[PDB]
Design a binder for this molecule. Structure first.
Ligand code: S4M
Ligand code: S4M
Ligand code: HAI
Ligand code: HAI
Lengths: 289, 294
């Protein structure tokens, strides 16, 4: 126990505390802290955990563990790219571990992977400590930009992207404006007609108010399809994460029935793609109202 | 009276917080902030805790493991009940094993066709504390169709008439403790015997992220026993280890049972279950699907 998010009661325990999920915390046994640093944007920790392999933490929040990252990486990537024909040019906002790069690379149709990550410290420790995730960076198709995805999207050419994937941290910290309407509007402008967005869109158990405004906002902006998907990620709070899938008006996009089917994938397949749009009654009624 | 020292259960990792520990999920714990510890008791089977959480309402704990929070209980009780009951026509006779919180009882009651709900819970203390501290519970013990027995469900199944149940739901605690043999081949054989032809069992069958060795053993055993359908489904439960849990669905030799396409549609309205997510619960991640249908 060295970092302030580590136990005052016993050595070698990390607990994920945050006002974003009050009264609850996922606690993980720590074999060793591998890195602590303060970047320009974030407090950054990597630790070797007993049972989840290596762990990336940003401002006290678990961004990734080796044991379960296939769930988030595969779903956030293949939900959008398997939903459209022949994707060629794709933009990753955040994605500092390079996991999304690794999944995007699986698509042979892809010619260009642009990535805009605000925090070089995250890139640094990701290539050093998680090479099986950060292998993403090695694909000759990748262009890596260190910068705020807000500004990058503003300077993107209108109608230039087949897909945008917003692999962002939580609304507390530098990803704050990535959750807000003007950022969604710049995504829309930068997408071809029938082009798609896939965002990190929180917990239906923990964040329904937030998700309800994101969806209302996306319905004002994207006149194609607007859909919400969820997945299991044990080491995210509540055990689940969700995604906004949105298309700009034009060629029809059916996110629930992928027409572009893709080591072997460890999580994603064509059936769980459609199953992730099958929300629980309490959520479904909100999401589609 | 003094007795044998029992370790601290509360504030083991964060002062004011319960952390859920077990060798069934090594090197991790779900932690919940504690407002008030309502009950601590030792029965003839288990350590029994009830506490008021800060953000998950009341929480039942058995042998240090969370069994239920008020906030997320709708996911397990709706799925483990309607996945089986919505897969067979006009169920009349249903057996619940364990289920001492009475949640399953409640979701079983939503079914008009049902005429008797047999229940066998080994631990009278869990019944008593669930009725005391939890709001829907004592009422959803009062449905005239409920026949509650205190006993080991292994014994109850050996007592049952051959082919006498349309459906059995095993709402059990983990293999460590009194539920051990509900996971084992002989109890499964005895469920298949108690079921009619085309009859259905739904079992609490752990986490695909945590328990794949265990799950492959249950599935392989079920395939040997139940010559109908054998299918594994999963759902989201935040306060269960890894935040998912699963269910073995099996039907015996008889009228075909399609657990994936439920022929039967269905505590106020359902909060969680719906026809679409019935189907979605059988769509497993690739690493699980290989092991489970191989
Ligand atoms: C690490 S990734 C989440 C883990 C699951 N792939 C989220 C990244 O978002 C970055 N981030 C946050 N805000 C921004 C903005 N505004 N722009 C770019 N990148 C951002 C942050 O530095 C993380 O590395
Ligand atoms: C509380 S319930 C699970 C929580 C979500 N409904 C699980 C119950 O199984 C009982 N249980 C455990 N072992 C057995 C046996 N062997 N027989 C019957 N009931 C059992 C145990 O006492 C709990 O009340
Ligand atoms: N808790 C958040 C951290 C980033 C990815 C998942 C959401
Ligand atoms: N860990 C288990 C305890 C209660 C039953 C389902 C999950």
């Amino acid at each position: 126990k060295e970092p302030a998010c580590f136990s005052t009661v016993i050595p070698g325990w990390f607990s994920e505390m945050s006002p974003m999920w009050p009264g609850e915390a996922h606690s993980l046994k720590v074999e060793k802290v591998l890195f602590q640093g303060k970047s320009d944007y974030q407090d950054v920790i990597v630790f070797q955990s007993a049972t989840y392999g290596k762990v990336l933490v940003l401002d006290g929040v678990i961004q990734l563990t080796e044991r379960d990252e296939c769930a988030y990486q595969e779903m956030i990537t293949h939900l959008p790219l398997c939903s459209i024909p022949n994707p060629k040019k794709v933009l990753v906002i955040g994605g500092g571990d390079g996991g999304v790069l690794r999944e995007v690379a699986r698509h042979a149709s892809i010619e260009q992977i642009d990535m805009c990550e605000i925090d070089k410290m995250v890139v640094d420790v990701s290539k050093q400590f998680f090479p099986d995730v950060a292998i993403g960076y090695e694909d000759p198709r990748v262009n890596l930009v260190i910068g705020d995805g807000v500004a990058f999207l503003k300077n993107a050419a209108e109608g230039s992207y087949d897909a945008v994937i917003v692999d962002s941290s939580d609304p507390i910290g530098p990803a704050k404006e990535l959750f807000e309407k003007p950022f969604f509007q710049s995504v829309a402008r930068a997408l071809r007609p029938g082009g798609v967005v896939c965002t990190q869109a929180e917990s239906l158990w923990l964040h329904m108010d937030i998700i309800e405004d994101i969806v209302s906002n996306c319905r004002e902006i994207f006149k194609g399809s607007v859909n919400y998907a969820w997945t299991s990620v044990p080491t995210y709070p509540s055990g689940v994460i969700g995604f906004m899938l949105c298309s700009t008006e034009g060629p029809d996009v059916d996110f629930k029935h992928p027409l572009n089917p893709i080591g072997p994938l460890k999580f994603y397949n064509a059936e769980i793609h459609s199953a992730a749009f099958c929300l629980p009654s309490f959520a479904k009624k909100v999401i589609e109202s």
